[PDB]
């Protein structure tokens, strides 16, 4: 139910 998650800019996905 979260409109705006906190993105990790140094994650796994390229």
């Amino acid at each position, epitope marked *: *139910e*979260v*409109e*705006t*998650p*906190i*993105r*990790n800019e140094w*994650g*796994c*996905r390229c």
Partner: nanobody
Framework: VQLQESGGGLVQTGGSLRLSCAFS??????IGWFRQAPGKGRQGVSC????????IYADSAKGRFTVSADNAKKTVYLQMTRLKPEDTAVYYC????????????????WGKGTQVTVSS
């Protein structure tokens, strides 16, 4: 599993407030703080990984808010400072299985919410 927020109230502009989230029934869980103003969506504020205490912040939380955990007390805290009227909202704690891409993508458990109101 259970989450319960406390510490909500009325704060003067520029003031501080500390919220608590009591947790029970946990694997590698994150406790996050999310806020929702009337008729708006839920916005991620700050999250902590209970295993090791690593943290991630929304841009507006950086510097002035600190999220922390006392695993012994099974409590997570959000210490807020320099509060403004735009910070007025229901604050929720939420739990999710650790996701390296960030916080708030799959919240599995929610607290009941605590009203924070900031005015002059």
């Amino acid at each position: 599993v259970q989450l319960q927020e406390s510490g909500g109230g009325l704060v003067q502009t520029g003031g501080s407030l500390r919220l608590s989230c009591a947790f029970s029934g946990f694997d590698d869980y994150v406790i996050g703080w999310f806020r929702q103003a009337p008729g708006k969506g839920r916005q991620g504020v700050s999250c902590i990984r209970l295993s090791g205490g690593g943290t991630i912040y929304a841009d507006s939380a950086k510097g002035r808010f600190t999220v922390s955990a006392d695993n012994a007390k099974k409590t997570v805290y959000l210490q807020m400072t320099r509060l403004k009227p735009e910070d007025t909202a229901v604050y929720y704690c939420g739990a999710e299985r650790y996701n390296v891409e960030g916080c708030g993508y799959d919240v599995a458990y929610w607290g009941k919410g605590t009203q924070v109101t900031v005015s002059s």
